[PDB]
């Protein structure tokens, strides 16, 4: 269907505990494929998905270099940041960076991203037009004048519109078996009496890829959304995902309820109910 490639960078300062920590990962849709950790024996860009490892030595060395450089450029970033907010050098602070592209099935840009957060809140972000910036406060505006002088936005547009998209096409192609073979969810319904008079019905969905999924409960053909509890979609540990939906029902009326599952890897949406034994 539609796809995206994202990078996520975390830079954490650590007072009296040496240089800061840098951990960044790369994702094509919901599949991690690359990692970099500055505390590893000898820091380098690493493969975290099968498909990405046939790539030649240049790819790896090039990215290792870009990660190594970042360690220094964002060392000063955390320095400057702590300066803009008149913060003690004894505290620990966090700089996060995310950027990437969204391509429709057709493979053309839907929108590019380049955002930053300091200590947990939006700091500065490139807008959808890819030519303007949105600063969270007057400190970020300092950054905004620096990058506007450097014609930074003009540089990112070249990457997001060029490099990002092309490497996304390439990746979705190399591992098209892992990346565009949608895994249908294994579903079932469980029953759990809360009391004498009330029972919980749990609609399960396991082993599905990608993460996007819709689980809804109905009392007769009628939706029950804020009668339904949903858990956050969680990783199974093997690249597939899991999720469940529960509703508390009056005992004896269990069969008035049905569960409806929607997922990309399914021919047609499923409809389940509880099996009395």
């Amino acid at each position: 269907g539609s796809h995206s490639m994202r990078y996520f960078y975390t830079a954490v300062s650590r007072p009296g505990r040496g240089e800061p920590r840098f951990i960044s990962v790369g994702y094509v849709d919901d599949t991690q494929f690359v990692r970099f950790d500055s505390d590893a024996a000898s820091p380098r860009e690493e493969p975290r998905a099968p498909w990405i490892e046939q790539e030649g030595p240049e790819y790896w060395d090039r990215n290792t270099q870009i990660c190594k450089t970042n360690t220094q450029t964002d060392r000063e970033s955390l320095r400057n940041l702590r300066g803009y907010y008149n913060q003690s050098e004894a505290g620990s602070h966090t700089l996060q960076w995310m950027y990437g592209c969204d391509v429709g099935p057709d493979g053309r840009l839907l929108r590019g991203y380049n955002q930053f957060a300091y200590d947990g809140k939006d700091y500065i972000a490139l807008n959808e037009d890819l030519s303007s910036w949105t600063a969270a406060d007057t400190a970020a505006q300092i950054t905004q004048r620096k990058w506007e002088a450097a014609r930074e936005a003009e540089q990112l547009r070249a990457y997001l519109e060029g490099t990002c998209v092309e490497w996304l096409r390439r990746h979705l192609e190399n591992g098209k078996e892992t990346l565009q073979r949608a895994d249908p969810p294994k579903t079932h319904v469980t029953h759990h009496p809360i009391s004498d008079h009330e029972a919980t019905l749990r609609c399960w969905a396991l082993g599905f890829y990608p993460a996007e999924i819709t689980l809804t409960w109905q009392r007769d053909g009628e939706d029950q959304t804020q009668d339904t509890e949903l858990v956050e979609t969680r990783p199974a540990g093997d690249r597939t995902f899991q999720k469940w939906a529960a509703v508390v029902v009056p005992s004896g009326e269990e069969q008035r309820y049905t569960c409806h599952v929607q997922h990309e890897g399914l021919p047609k949406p499923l409809t389940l109910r509880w099996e009395p034994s």
Binding site: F8, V25, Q32, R35, Q96, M98, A117, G120, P235, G237
Partner: peptide, 16 residues
């Protein structure tokens, strides 16, 4: 797993 984060900049990890 490797440290990643969500839209709202919140962190998440799977320990297994």
């Amino acid at each position: 797993s490797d440290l990643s984060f969500s839209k709202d900049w919140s962190f998440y990890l799977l320990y297994y």
